Amino acid sequence: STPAITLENPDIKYPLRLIDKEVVNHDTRRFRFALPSPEHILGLPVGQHIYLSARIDGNLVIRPYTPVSSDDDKGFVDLVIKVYFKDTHPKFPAGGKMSQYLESMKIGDTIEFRGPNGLLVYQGKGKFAIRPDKKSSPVIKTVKSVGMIAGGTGITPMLQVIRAIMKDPDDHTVCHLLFANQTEKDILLRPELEELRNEHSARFKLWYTVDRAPEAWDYSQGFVNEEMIRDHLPPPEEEPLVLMCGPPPMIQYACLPNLERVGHPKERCFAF
Numbered sequence: 001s002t003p004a005i006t007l008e009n010p011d012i013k014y015p016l017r018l019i020d021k022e023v024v025n026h027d028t029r030r031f032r033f034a035l036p037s038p039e040h041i042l043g044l045p046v047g048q049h050i051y052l053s054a055r056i057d058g059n060l061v062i063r064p065y066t067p068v069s070s071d072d073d074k075g076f077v078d079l080v081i082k083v084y085f086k087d088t089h090p091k092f093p094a095g096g097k098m099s100q101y102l103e104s105m106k107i108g109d110t111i112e113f114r115g116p117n118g119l120l121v122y123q124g125k126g127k128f129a130i131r132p133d134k135k136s137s138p139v140i141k142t143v144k145s146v147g148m149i150a151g152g153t154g155i156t157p158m159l160q161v162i163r164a165i166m167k168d169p170d171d172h173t174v175c176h177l178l179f180a181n182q183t184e185k186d187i188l189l190r191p192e193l194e195e196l197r198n199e200h201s202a203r204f205k206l207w208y209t210v211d212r213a214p215e216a217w218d219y220s221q222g223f224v225n226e227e228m229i230r231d232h233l234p235p236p237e238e239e240p241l242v243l244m245c246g247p248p249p250m251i252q253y254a255c256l257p258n259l260e261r262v263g264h265p266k267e268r269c270f271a272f
């Protein structure tokens, strides 16, 4: 049989109860929410995400999240969240709306989930189904490798795909991740990524860049650039799929221009 799914209809909101909050580090949390029963699964295809919605200080706020759990997990969904506190970053004095609201929640409070959403679904063994828009059928494309460029919170769409590939021992797709962050301290999910590298180095290539580097730093410094794409993503000759998720200026200035300079078809580079 198959487990009951939570996300039965994408236009329904499902209020899920907060059951655990882990303080990962000063500004990182893992939130665990109960599904409708211990035997349910979320029902989130690999490649897709959920939305959280809430009334935050009187206004509707909707944001996308990719869980760090999977449909293998029965009874709960886990979200890893970077909390953007007010009065930290000079360009963002108010901090982040949904992430601070999540940080405010008490155990037992609910928040609305919806999904699945997104134009890309991973069908396994290198095959991706990518719709040009929601109203259109997917282009099925099968690749031997996947370049991945994540910035900041944009890691979780990548991690979800990486994990789905690595857990299939007969999936020979090679993932190459280039992961950008403000600082070393701000990197999400480093232990998790490094466990995957330890176990799956033949299929999983990992590299970091940071806007500013610590004194002891083994990786790159600066924004994603042409050299980093040449050195840390599959070459365009191999026709990889290129996936991206990060802040709009990162995609616009750092990623697309440099993917083009290396020769990847810019129009085929997919942004989550």
Ligand SMILES: Cc1cc2nc3c(=O)[nH]c(=O)nc-3n(C[C@H](O)[C@H](O)[C@H](O)COP(=O)(O)OP(=O)(O)OC[C@H]3O[C@@H](n4cnc5c(N)ncnc54)[C@H](O)[C@@H]3O)c2cc1C
Binding pocket: 049, 063, 064, 065, 066, 067, 079, 080, 081, 082, 083, 084, 085, 086, 088, 089, 092, 094, 095, 096, 097, 098, 099, 100, 153, 154, 156, 157, 245, 247, 272
């Ligand atoms: C497919 C997808 C999956 C995602 N999955 C996740 C996930 O698993 N986990 C997750 O945490 N987010 C994830 N995000 C990001 C998420 O959607 C939100 O952008 C994030 O939670 C911030 O929203 P907010 O309402 O708190 O901030 P907003 O109010 O929307 O603030 C706007 C922007 O201001 C910047 N900002 C505000 N305060 C600061 C500060 N103190 N320092 C630096 N920058 C700051 C951030 O870039 C922020 O995104 C995902 C995004 C996408 C597209």
